[PDB]
Scaffold this motif. Structure first.
Motif, PDB file in Angstrom:
ATOM      1  N   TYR A   1       0.741  -1.262   0.000  1.00  0.00           N
ATOM      2  CA  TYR A   1       0.000   0.000   0.000  1.00  0.00           C
ATOM      3  C   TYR A   1       0.778   1.324   0.000  1.00  0.00           C
ATOM      4  O   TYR A   1       0.521   2.198  -0.835  1.00  0.00           O
ATOM      5  CB  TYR A   1      -0.970  -0.033   1.181  1.00  0.00           C
ATOM      6  CG  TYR A   1      -1.965   1.096   1.227  1.00  0.00           C
ATOM      7  CD1 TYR A   1      -2.924   1.255   0.223  1.00  0.00           C
ATOM      8  CD2 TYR A   1      -1.984   1.979   2.304  1.00  0.00           C
ATOM      9  CE1 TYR A   1      -3.878   2.260   0.294  1.00  0.00           C
ATOM     10  CE2 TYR A   1      -2.929   2.982   2.388  1.00  0.00           C
ATOM     11  CZ  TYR A   1      -3.872   3.117   1.383  1.00  0.00           C
ATOM     12  OH  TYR A   1      -4.819   4.106   1.489  1.00  0.00           O
TER      13      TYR A   1
ATOM     14  N   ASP B   1     -11.260   2.892  -3.328  1.00  0.00           N
ATOM     15  CA  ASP B   1     -10.282   3.017  -4.400  1.00  0.00           C
ATOM     16  C   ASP B   1      -9.506   1.731  -4.666  1.00  0.00           C
ATOM     17  O   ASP B   1      -9.331   0.893  -3.775  1.00  0.00           O
ATOM     18  CB  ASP B   1      -9.286   4.139  -4.087  1.00  0.00           C
ATOM     19  CG  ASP B   1      -9.930   5.514  -4.078  1.00  0.00           C
ATOM     20  OD1 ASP B   1     -10.813   5.755  -4.931  1.00  0.00           O
ATOM     21  OD2 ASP B   1      -9.541   6.355  -3.235  1.00  0.00           O
TER      22      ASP B   1
ATOM     23  N   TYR C   1      -7.732   0.960 -13.480  1.00  0.00           N
ATOM     24  CA  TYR C   1      -7.606  -0.076 -12.473  1.00  0.00           C
ATOM     25  C   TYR C   1      -8.918  -0.836 -12.323  1.00  0.00           C
ATOM     26  O   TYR C   1      -9.838  -0.374 -11.648  1.00  0.00           O
ATOM     27  CB  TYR C   1      -7.204   0.570 -11.152  1.00  0.00           C
ATOM     28  CG  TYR C   1      -6.001   1.466 -11.293  1.00  0.00           C
ATOM     29  CD1 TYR C   1      -4.758   0.945 -11.655  1.00  0.00           C
ATOM     30  CD2 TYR C   1      -6.105   2.841 -11.103  1.00  0.00           C
ATOM     31  CE1 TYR C   1      -3.647   1.771 -11.825  1.00  0.00           C
ATOM     32  CE2 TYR C   1      -5.003   3.678 -11.273  1.00  0.00           C
ATOM     33  CZ  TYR C   1      -3.779   3.134 -11.635  1.00  0.00           C
ATOM     34  OH  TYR C   1      -2.691   3.962 -11.815  1.00  0.00           O
TER      35      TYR C   1
ATOM     36  N   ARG D   1      -3.939   4.762 -16.461  1.00  0.00           N
ATOM     37  CA  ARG D   1      -4.382   4.881 -15.078  1.00  0.00           C
ATOM     38  C   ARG D   1      -5.720   4.176 -14.879  1.00  0.00           C
ATOM     39  O   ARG D   1      -6.589   4.650 -14.148  1.00  0.00           O
ATOM     40  CB  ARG D   1      -4.488   6.353 -14.670  1.00  0.00           C
ATOM     41  CG  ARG D   1      -3.172   7.102 -14.793  1.00  0.00           C
ATOM     42  CD  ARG D   1      -3.255   8.529 -14.262  1.00  0.00           C
ATOM     43  NE  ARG D   1      -2.053   9.293 -14.601  1.00  0.00           N
ATOM     44  CZ  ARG D   1      -1.816  10.546 -14.216  1.00  0.00           C
ATOM     45  NH1 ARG D   1      -2.699  11.195 -13.466  1.00  0.00           N
ATOM     46  NH2 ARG D   1      -0.693  11.155 -14.584  1.00  0.00           N
TER      47      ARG D   1
ATOM     48  N   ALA E   1      -1.804   2.231  -3.696  1.00  0.00           N
ATOM     49  CA  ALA E   1      -2.779   3.279  -3.433  1.00  0.00           C
ATOM     50  C   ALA E   1      -2.498   4.206  -2.263  1.00  0.00           C
ATOM     51  O   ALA E   1      -3.259   5.146  -2.045  1.00  0.00           O
ATOM     52  CB  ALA E   1      -4.163   2.659  -3.259  1.00  0.00           C
TER      53      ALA E   1
ATOM     54  N   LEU F   1      -0.540  -1.337  -8.322  1.00  0.00           N
ATOM     55  CA  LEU F   1      -0.812   0.004  -7.840  1.00  0.00           C
ATOM     56  C   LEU F   1      -0.729   0.155  -6.328  1.00  0.00           C
ATOM     57  O   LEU F   1      -1.466  -0.486  -5.579  1.00  0.00           O
ATOM     58  CB  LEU F   1      -2.205   0.442  -8.288  1.00  0.00           C
ATOM     59  CG  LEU F   1      -2.753   1.643  -7.516  1.00  0.00           C
ATOM     60  CD1 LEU F   1      -2.236   2.917  -8.156  1.00  0.00           C
ATOM     61  CD2 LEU F   1      -4.265   1.618  -7.517  1.00  0.00           C
TER      62      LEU F   1
ATOM     63  N   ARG G   1      -7.335  -2.639  -1.350  1.00  0.00           N
ATOM     64  CA  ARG G   1      -6.284  -1.900  -0.684  1.00  0.00           C
ATOM     65  C   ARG G   1      -5.643  -2.672   0.463  1.00  0.00           C
ATOM     66  O   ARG G   1      -5.579  -2.189   1.600  1.00  0.00           O
ATOM     67  CB  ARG G   1      -6.847  -0.569  -0.190  1.00  0.00           C
ATOM     68  CG  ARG G   1      -7.377   0.275  -1.327  1.00  0.00           C
ATOM     69  CD  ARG G   1      -8.237   1.414  -0.860  1.00  0.00           C
ATOM     70  NE  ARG G   1      -9.549   0.935  -0.458  1.00  0.00           N
ATOM     71  CZ  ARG G   1      -9.945   0.839   0.803  1.00  0.00           C
ATOM     72  NH1 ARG G   1      -9.130   1.194   1.789  1.00  0.00           N
ATOM     73  NH2 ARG G   1     -11.156   0.379   1.074  1.00  0.00           N
TER      74      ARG G   1
ATOM     75  N   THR H   1     -11.975  -2.752 -11.209  1.00  0.00           N
ATOM     76  CA  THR H   1     -12.510  -2.932  -9.867  1.00  0.00           C
ATOM     77  C   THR H   1     -13.142  -4.308  -9.739  1.00  0.00           C
ATOM     78  O   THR H   1     -13.339  -5.004 -10.738  1.00  0.00           O
ATOM     79  CB  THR H   1     -13.581  -1.887  -9.530  1.00  0.00           C
ATOM     80  OG1 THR H   1     -14.687  -2.032 -10.430  1.00  0.00           O
ATOM     81  CG2 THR H   1     -13.006  -0.488  -9.633  1.00  0.00           C
TER      82      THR H   1
END
Ligand SMILES: Nc1ncnc2c1ncn2[C@@H]1O[C@H](CSCC[C@H](N)C(=O)O)[C@@H](O)[C@H]1O
Ligand SMILES: Nc1ncnc2c1ncn2[C@@H]1O[C@H](CSCC[C@H](N)C(=O)O)[C@@H](O)[C@H]1O
Lengths: 265, 265
Positions: free
Chosen positions: B11, B231, B175, B173, B40, B38, B208, B177
């Motif tokens: 993270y 996110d 991502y 960009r 986050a 990623l 996350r 979900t």
């Protein structure tokens, strides 16, 4: 009011994540267990010094049986750290300790760390290709477990790799070697005769992951069955059909025989 | 004159291992790539600050087509470090970059970090019960990848969980979900119609991982496909045949319907 399950890493006291080290330092109390697995690259003392706080070791019983009496009580009024080798909720039953935390009105947070489950990626074998995992347990008395045998068979049949965690007697500080696991399988093969594990089966041995100088060897059972892979902990992997790329990595980095480039691809 | 592969974690910048940090600190040049996953919870600035070095970020093409041109060369004169999100050899083809380093005459070492592959432990599902993994790929135009469907099928058949790595297009960009993944799976249900993924299927979402408060949710496709999980990055899991103990953690910590507790033996 908060309990942190902090992962300790793979090998030595420096495999803990920075997040885990700072959070440990900020805790009022710090417990740790060392039975689920063992940090071969370090010592309880070295760990204590790094963190700074004094660590109280818990036994399997202390955890599994009286975690709510030894740990949780303090976690109520303070910030407590629970340290475990590798990654907190991996290969252990610790995940249910979070349920107990909730029952006692205690918040729990997880701090991860490298696991052997993900560090096998250093073997060049594709993570996505790993199937069901299993443990090779020592035969005891009249008990002779042989389920891992089948796990290896169902994975190979579908072209997946099998990760075999080797047995460990944390207390007796006794580790099971890759050789001992290769020996047992040969005996299970000889009893079940399914053609799953034999002197011709290709295997990978990852020893002391986490170290800068881990031991990564690939080869045929008949050739590795008596090879010295160094001090524990050991990990045995019975690969399925190899990718040309997977195979090249085993040859170029784990000293695999060139034969695997034609026989196991 | 060596090359270090260092994991940055799940993270934020504090998810790197102390071992990793202290090594990155004493390196001459520090490369990286943020396209395989990623993080986050951090920035290139915060990492650089923590590392106390200037990090030159490479592109997939820089790495895949010019690693031995942009990176290895320096490795012969200095200690170079190549950073990556999570663990560097998990769900990536970086392990192949080691074969390069070798043929270039450059010793390489690997420093692990928490990986989403083992972080799924926090979901309460047994790590050894996961079978083959897969990625849910973004459709590109008239191309519609379906592979992952059969992976789920093949695993559920054996009563094993399936880890679904969601797609990423760092450049744009984008991502994927857990919702988008579910939506895509349903469509694939119409295509193949194998009763593999439906409104009634139980799924687990982890969002996350690595943060102190990741989103851990478990439920039925119909009830989750429309739910906000926060996110990215996201990871979707299709459990196989639960254990009573897995079911409890899902209910108690994931917020799953209590009905799942009553397993069908
Ligand atoms: N550094 C290492 N190298 C090789 N094998 C390891 C190892 N650390 C642990 N193991 C394997 O993992 C077993 C412990 S079972 C628990 C795994 C631990 N929670 C983790 O996340 O890593 C050991 O008995 C051994 O079989
Ligand atoms: N912190 C995180 N939380 C949730 N999902 C994550 C995650 N990190 C990675 N993922 C999942 O994994 C995908 C990237 S694949 C790269 C994984 C990385 N090498 C590792 O060791 O973890 C993401 O698109 C997402 O699907």
């Amino acid at each position: 009011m908060v309990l942190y399950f902090i992962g300790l890493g793979l090998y030595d006291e420096r495999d803990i994540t920075v997040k885990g080290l700072e959070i440990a330092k900020k805790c009022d109390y710090v417990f740790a267990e060392f039975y689920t697995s063992l940090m071969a690259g370090t010592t309880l003392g070295r760990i204590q010094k790094l963190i700074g706080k004094e660590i109280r070791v818990l036994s399997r019983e202390d955890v599994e049986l009286n975690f709510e009496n030894i740990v949780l009580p303090l976690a109520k009024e303070n910030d407590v750290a629970f340290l475990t080798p590798g990654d907190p909720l991996v290969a252990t039953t610790h995940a249910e300790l979070r349920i107990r935390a909730k029952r006692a009105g205690v918040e729990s947070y997880v701090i991860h760390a490298p696991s052997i489950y993900s560090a096998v990626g250093i073997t060049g074998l594709h993570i996505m290709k790993f199937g069901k995992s299993a443990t090779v347990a020592y035969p005891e008395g009249n008990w002779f477990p042989t389920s891992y045998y089948d796990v290896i068979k169902e994975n190979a049949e579908r072209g997946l790799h099998t990760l075999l965690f080797l047995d460990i007697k944390a207390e007796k500080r006794m580790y099971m070697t890759a050789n001992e696991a290769m020996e047992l399988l040969l005996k299970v093969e000889d009893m079940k005769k399914g053609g799953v594990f034999t002197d011709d089966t290709l295997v990978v041995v990852l020893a002391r992951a986490g170290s800068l100088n881990p031991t990564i060897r690939a080869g045929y059972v008949k050739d590795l069955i008596r090879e010295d892979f160094g001090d524990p902990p050991h990990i045995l992997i019975v690969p399925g059909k190899l990718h040309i790329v997977e195979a090249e990595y085993l040859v170029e980095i784990a000293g695999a025989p060139r034969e695997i480039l034609r026989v196991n691809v």
